[PDB]
Design an enzyme around this catalytic site. Structure first.
Site, short mmCIF file in Angstrom:
data_model
loop_
_atom_site.label_atom_id
_atom_site.label_comp_id
_atom_site.label_asym_id
_atom_site.label_seq_id
_atom_site.Cartn_x
_atom_site.Cartn_y
_atom_site.Cartn_z
N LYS A 1 0.85 -1.20 0.00
CA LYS A 1 0.00 0.00 0.00
C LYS A 1 0.89 1.26 0.00
O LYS A 1 2.10 1.17 -0.23
CB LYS A 1 -0.97 -0.05 1.17
CG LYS A 1 -2.03 -1.17 1.00
CD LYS A 1 -3.17 -0.65 0.17
CE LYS A 1 -4.39 -0.47 1.01
NZ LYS A 1 -5.25 0.64 0.50
N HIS B 1 -4.49 13.98 10.71
CA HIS B 1 -3.13 13.90 10.18
C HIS B 1 -2.21 14.93 10.82
O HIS B 1 -0.99 14.73 10.87
CB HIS B 1 -3.14 14.04 8.65
CG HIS B 1 -3.65 12.82 7.95
ND1 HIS B 1 -4.93 12.73 7.44
CD2 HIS B 1 -3.07 11.62 7.72
CE1 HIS B 1 -5.10 11.53 6.90
NE2 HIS B 1 -3.99 10.84 7.05
N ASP C 1 2.05 7.32 3.99
CA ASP C 1 1.02 8.20 4.53
C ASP C 1 1.56 8.78 5.83
O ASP C 1 2.00 8.03 6.71
CB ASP C 1 -0.31 7.42 4.74
CG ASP C 1 -1.43 8.25 5.39
OD1 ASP C 1 -2.61 7.85 5.26
OD2 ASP C 1 -1.16 9.29 6.04
N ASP D 1 -5.96 17.71 7.68
CA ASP D 1 -7.04 17.59 8.66
C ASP D 1 -6.43 17.44 10.05
O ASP D 1 -5.22 17.26 10.22
CB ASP D 1 -7.97 16.41 8.30
CG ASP D 1 -7.24 15.08 8.27
OD1 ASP D 1 -6.61 14.73 9.29
OD2 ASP D 1 -7.31 14.36 7.25
C1 LIG Z 1 -10.27 13.70 9.81
C2 LIG Z 1 -10.71 12.38 9.16
C3 LIG Z 1 -9.67 11.27 9.36
C4 LIG Z 1 -10.12 9.88 8.85
C5 LIG Z 1 -9.10 8.71 9.28
C6 LIG Z 1 -9.16 8.55 10.77
N1 LIG Z 1 -10.34 7.91 11.28
C7 LIG Z 1 -10.73 8.02 12.69
C8 LIG Z 1 -11.95 8.56 13.04
C9 LIG Z 1 -12.29 8.66 14.39
C10 LIG Z 1 -11.41 8.22 15.37
C11 LIG Z 1 -10.18 7.67 15.02
O1 LIG Z 1 -9.31 7.20 16.03
C12 LIG Z 1 -7.92 7.25 15.80
F1 LIG Z 1 -7.53 6.28 14.93
F2 LIG Z 1 -7.27 7.04 16.98
F3 LIG Z 1 -7.55 8.46 15.29
C13 LIG Z 1 -9.85 7.57 13.68
C14 LIG Z 1 -11.16 7.13 10.33
O2 LIG Z 1 -12.15 6.57 10.70
C15 LIG Z 1 -10.68 7.05 8.82
N2 LIG Z 1 -9.37 7.50 8.62
C16 LIG Z 1 -9.02 7.49 7.37
C17 LIG Z 1 -7.47 7.39 7.27
C18 LIG Z 1 -6.63 8.45 7.03
N3 LIG Z 1 -5.39 7.98 7.03
C19 LIG Z 1 -5.42 6.65 7.29
N4 LIG Z 1 -6.72 6.30 7.43
C20 LIG Z 1 -7.20 4.94 7.67
C21 LIG Z 1 -7.78 4.72 9.09
C22 LIG Z 1 -7.21 5.32 10.22
C23 LIG Z 1 -7.76 5.06 11.48
C24 LIG Z 1 -8.88 4.24 11.61
C25 LIG Z 1 -9.50 3.96 12.98
N5 LIG Z 1 -9.96 3.76 14.00
C26 LIG Z 1 -9.45 3.65 10.47
C27 LIG Z 1 -8.89 3.90 9.22
C1 LIG Z 2 -6.08 4.10 19.16
C2 LIG Z 2 -6.66 3.74 17.78
C3 LIG Z 2 -8.17 3.95 17.54
C4 LIG Z 2 -5.83 3.26 16.85
C5 LIG Z 2 -6.24 2.85 15.42
C6 LIG Z 2 -5.28 3.50 14.44
C7 LIG Z 2 -5.39 3.08 12.97
C8 LIG Z 2 -4.54 3.90 11.98
C9 LIG Z 2 -6.14 2.07 12.54
C10 LIG Z 2 -6.22 1.69 11.05
C11 LIG Z 2 -7.38 0.69 10.80
C12 LIG Z 2 -7.70 0.46 9.31
C13 LIG Z 2 -8.95 -0.38 8.99
C14 LIG Z 2 -6.92 0.96 8.34
C15 LIG Z 2 -7.17 0.77 6.82
O1 LIG Z 2 -7.68 1.94 6.22
P1 LIG Z 2 -7.29 2.41 4.68
O2 LIG Z 2 -7.44 1.25 3.71
O3 LIG Z 2 -8.20 3.57 4.36
O4 LIG Z 2 -5.76 2.97 4.63
P2 LIG Z 2 -4.41 2.18 4.15
O5 LIG Z 2 -4.46 2.14 2.64
O6 LIG Z 2 -3.25 3.03 4.64
O7 LIG Z 2 -4.33 0.80 4.73
ZN LIG Z 3 -3.44 8.80 7.02
#
Ligand SMILES: CCCC[C@H]1CN(c2cccc(OC(F)(F)F)c2)C(=O)CN1Cc1cncn1Cc1ccc(C#N)cc1
Ligand SMILES: CC(C)=CCC/C(C)=C/CC/C(C)=C/COP(=O)(O)OP(=O)(O)O
Ligand SMILES: [Zn+2]
Ligand SMILES: O=S(=O)(O)C[C@H](O)CNC1CCCCC1
Ligand SMILES: O=S(=O)(O)C[C@H](O)CNC1CCCCC1
Ligand SMILES: O=S(=O)(O)C[C@H](O)CNC1CCCCC1
Lengths: 318, 497
Positions: free
Chosen positions: B319, B388, B322, B385
């Site tokens: 992948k 990030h 990031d 955002d």
């Molecule tokens: C401002 C919007 C940000 C959106 C982010 C964070 N995000 C989120 C929303 C609410 C709480 C939270 O918790 C914590 F992870 F600790 F930040 C996390 C999500 O749902 C989707 N994302 C997309 C993303 C961006 N870059 C990598 N990804 C993949 C990813 C990262 C974490 C998680 C989880 N879980 C799932 C997927």
């Molecule tokens: C404390 C806490 C809540 C921690 C969780 C942190 C975290 C980054 C979780 C990722 C989970 C997840 C399903 C990522 C894939 O998303 P994607 O396919 O959009 O991104 P990718 O291409 O980088 O894998």
């Molecule tokens: Zn990211």
């Protein structure tokens, strides 16, 4: 134009309840009129614990605006079971959500709770839906984790036949044919062939698996997914590295597959993970100085982004 | 100090080779390589004193990032409704980023933060993603709210900490309602089960002195079985019961085996390493079940991108890089490194990832273009955002400051601990669910407290790419708050001083 719920006959008996933020909250969100109005009435519905069709309709309106609203999904599922609603209709509604790009952890978990409660005698048509749903994003992490859960849960109940496992491996092989760099499909192959409790472990299956791995590397020598699968395989089954080294040595410049006599074009040498294989092979033979020299070259010449890690490996030899 | 951390600008940039086999993964990789490498080519090398004329200056634009976050204290547009169930995260991303950037909030603003979060706290136990009259408690908002109160609160009657102390029993009861027999936790009533929940719960339980044996049973086994053949960790593991074809597939406390449910990911690897590390402080017999630390360290370093992708981390094999994985993957490196160190010690120094390249990725590629909204982002081409911004900066902090868990610091902590001070013991849900006696409970409190305060910044290990004006504050591995917040917060709940 929008008709507020205070002006709707179906809702005249309900006194809405405002969000209780306190006087001057931080991170306030400027909600649309539709969202604030729906949440005002949801607060009243959930306070009186009403389980009704209008409450059901209200939850759908809210999760369409915010699909990650876990509280409203929790209330929606208790509505479905309390009203004895058609869980197959709800499953079709979740299919439409995916089509409309309404997605979250909460939607995927809702789908899991539906399958768990329906408890189908044969989950074949859900398996086939999940396969098709991967077309717009073949690496969607939630989808792959759900697929693992589906086969694990229903195999625990004894409901996954041998024909179903066989067609699942056929599908997995096709995914990897279309994109050999799909690490999610490699992970699935590991479940199918190695980790699931029903997997076969014989000398034939070990040989077959090693042939598939080696052929995959020769097709795409720089594919990290294939190298990691090879190392995990050998480690998990306590298999020696030396007897396979003939198939690997051409990348560091008998019975199992060999590299193409002219290597594929755009295959610059050496392949750093091939060097790691060679170094670990030397360690297996107790030739720690030969391993150290390979780590030193990985560190200073061939994989310099990881110079410190490869230097850490070099020192471990002494 | 930089012998083994070469700059991206000093290395040859070349695309990932195709081997004459195109695929969708490679198309996307090559497109991303072109995006990042073109921005590096437009940007002056941060390590040079003669900044090329006409090229962009990569210094950390701290004031732009501060003004980006300032909207959190006025209002967010309607598009943020998608995060309306995660408002404590909006608080945390903001107030922790300001801590890292070195920007103080005044007391009135801190008081508003405290008051907002306390309205999210249910009397029955735990924080939700919004007001308690609107949302039910959830493990992830509970972590974000507790950490935010560590950052913005205080020990006075309006500081929020005394409300946390009074809520300890109800929060513990929420945690036990979430607990599954196989060692997993649901994140909320009827919610999903993965290591994000375990991580958020173990941090809060560690900080508030509400750990018990009944809370921890099988938690180590659930996490350990999430490790995959690649060395990282998946979201969850499935417990297969003792009897093959079963009338029920619901989790049990004595499964025949456990199997990981998806591929290794940086987010779940961070949660798993951090959870496992917190469990190693707990004095239970043959606990926690071990992990393969060397495989996890190997997986961690393999996710750092090539020079052409600027040395950022990706979240999983094949992948894209990031910026947010600077925290999730980069921040796991000191934890994995310490666990490897203990394994070597039990059976009987250069940096472990490219600390320089990671900073160059942050400065050159992850900042919003100058003269604009500010904020940090995933990659070029993506809007910045708050999420990030927080995780880019948390990862930058780990790259700038060499963190390690110091056995001699833990020993000093043990020597100063006062076991005659503390808040009331939690009452377990099951009669035999607590510690066996007061000697055992006080020994547990001492170890958990002393190890939570064992992370140090190594003297002389600092590397600040681009000059000292790029320096940010030091975050703590495992908790991800500044050490100067962690220490007074955890000391308040253990009644130490
Ligand atoms: C401002 C919007 C940000 C959106 C982010 C964070 N995000 C989120 C929303 C609410 C709480 C939270 O918790 C914590 F992870 F600790 F930040 C996390 C999500 O749902 C989707 N994302 C997309 C993303 C961006 N870059 C990598 N990804 C993949 C990813 C990262 C974490 C998680 C989880 N879980 C799932 C997927
Ligand atoms: C404390 C806490 C809540 C921690 C969780 C942190 C975290 C980054 C979780 C990722 C989970 C997840 C399903 C990522 C894939 O998303 P994607 O396919 O959009 O991104 P990718 O291409 O980088 O894998
Ligand atoms: Zn990211
Ligand atoms: O976040 S930073 O990039 O360091 C700060 C912004 O560049 C503000 N630049 C101003 C331009 C006019 C003179 C005063 C400074
Ligand atoms: O008194 S407690 O049970 O501790 C807290 C409140 O009852 C929570 N009730 C809300 C109603 C609306 C939906 C979200 C929850
Ligand atoms: O402290 S040192 O590392 O020796 C060098 C200083 O930090 C230089 N920072 C620059 C000064 C001029 C404006 C842009 C930043």
């Amino acid at each position: 134009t929008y008709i507020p719920m205070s002006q709707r006959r179906s809702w005249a008996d309900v006194k809405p309840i405002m969000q209780d933020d306190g006087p001057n909250p931080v991170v306030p969100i400027m909600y649309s009129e539709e969202y604030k109005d729906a949440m005002d009435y949801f607060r009243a519905i959930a306070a009186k614990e009403e389980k009704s069709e209008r409450a059901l309709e209200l939850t759908e309106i809210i999760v369409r605006m915010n699909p990650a609203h876990y509280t409203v999904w929790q209330y929606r599922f208790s509505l479905l079971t309390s009203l004895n609603k058609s869980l197959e209709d709800e499953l079709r509604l979740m299919n439409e959500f995916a089509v409309q790009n309404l997605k979250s952890y909460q939607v995927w978990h809702h789908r899991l709770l539906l399958l768990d409660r329906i408890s189908p005698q044969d989950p074949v048509s859900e398996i086939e839906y999940i396969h098709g749903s991967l077309l717009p994003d073949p690496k969607n992490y939630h989808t792959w984790a759900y697929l693992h859960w589906l086969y694990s849960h229903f195999s625990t109940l004894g409901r996954i036949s041998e024909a179903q496992w066989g067609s699942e491996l056929d599908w997995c092989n096709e995914m990897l044919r279309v994109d050999g760099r799909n690490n999610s499909a490699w992970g699935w192959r590991w479940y199918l062939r190695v980790s699931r409790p029903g997997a076969e472990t014989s000398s034939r299956s070990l040989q077959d698996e090693l042939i598939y791995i080696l052929k995959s590397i020769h097709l795409i020598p720089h594919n990290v997914s294939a190298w990691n699968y090879l190392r995990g395989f050998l480690k998990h089954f306590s298999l020696p590295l030396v007897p396979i080294l003939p198939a690997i040595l051409p990348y560091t410049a008998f019975g199992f597959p060999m590299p193409s006599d002219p290597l594929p074009e755009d295959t610059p040498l050496p392949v750093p993970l091939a060097l790691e294989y060679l170094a670990d092979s030397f360690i297996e033979q107790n030739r720690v100085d030969d391993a150290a020299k390979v780590f030193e070259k990985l560190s200073s010449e061939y994989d310099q982004m990881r110079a410190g890690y490869w230097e850490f490996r070099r020192r471990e030899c002494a | 100090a930089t012998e083994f951390t070469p700059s991206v600008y000093s290395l040859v940039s070349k695309p990932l080779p195709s081997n004459s086999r195109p695929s969708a993964t490679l198309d996307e990789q090559a497109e991303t390589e072109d995006l990042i490498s073109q921005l590096f080519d437009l940007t002056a090398d941060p390590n040079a004193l003669v900044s090329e004329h006409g090229k962009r200056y990569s210094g950390l634009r701290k004031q732009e990032h501060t003004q980006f976050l300032a909207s959190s204290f006025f209002q967010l547009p309607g598009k943020f409704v998608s995060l309306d169930a995660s408002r404590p995260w909006l608080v945390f991303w903001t107030v922790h980023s300001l801590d890292l950037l070195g920007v103080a909030l005044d007391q009135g603003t801190k008081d508003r933060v405290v008051s907002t979060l306390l309205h999210f706290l249910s009397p029955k136990g735990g924080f939700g993603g919004g007001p308690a009259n609107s949302q039910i408690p959830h493990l992830l908002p509970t972590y974000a709210s507790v950490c935010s109160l560590a950052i913005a609160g205080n020990d006075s009657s309006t500081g929020g900490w005394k409300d946390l102390a009074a809520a300890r029993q109800s929060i513990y009861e929420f945690f036990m309602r979430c607990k599954r027999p196989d060692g997993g936790f649901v994140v909320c009533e009827g919610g999903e089960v993965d290591v994000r929940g375990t991580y958020c719960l173990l941090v809060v339980a560690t900080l508030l002195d509400i750990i018990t044996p009944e809370l921890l049973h099988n938690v180590d086994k659930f996490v350990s079985a999430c490790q995959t053949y690649e060395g990282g960790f998946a979201c969850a593991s499935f417990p297969f019961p003792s009897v093959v074809p079963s009338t029920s597939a619901f989790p049990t406390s004595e499964p025949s085996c456990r199997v990981s449910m998806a591929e290794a990911h940086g987010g779940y690897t961070s949660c798993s390493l951090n959870s496992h590390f917190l469990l190693t402080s707990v004095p239970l017999p043959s606990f926690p079940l071990s992990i393969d630390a060397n495989a996890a360290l190997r997986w961690t370093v393999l996710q750092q991108g090539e020079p052409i992708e600027g040395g950022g981390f990706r979240g999983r094999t094949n992948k894209l890089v990031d910026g947010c994985y600077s925290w999730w993957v980069g921040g796991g490196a000191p934890v994995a490194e310490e666990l490897v160190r203990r394994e070597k010690s039990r059976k009987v120094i250069p940096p472990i990832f490219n600390r320089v390249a990671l900073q160059e990725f942050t400065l050159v590629a992850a900042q919003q273009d100058p003269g604009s909204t500010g904020g940090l982002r995933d990659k070029p081409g993506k809007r910045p955002d708050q999420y990030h911004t927080c995780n880019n900066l948390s990862g930058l902090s780990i790259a700038q400051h060499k963190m390690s868990h110091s056995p001699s610091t833990v020993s000093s902590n043990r020597l100063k601990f006062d076991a005659s001070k503390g808040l009331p013991a939690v009452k377990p849900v099951a009669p035999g669910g607590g510690w066996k006696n007061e000697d055992e409970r006080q020994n547990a409190r001492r170890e958990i407290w002393a190890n939570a305060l064992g992370w140090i910044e190594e003297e002389g290990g600092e590397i600040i790419v681009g000059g000292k004006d790029n320096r940010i504050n030091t975050t703590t591995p495992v908790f991800n708050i500044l050490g100067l917040r962690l220490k007074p917060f955890i000391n308040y709940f253990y009644c130490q001083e």
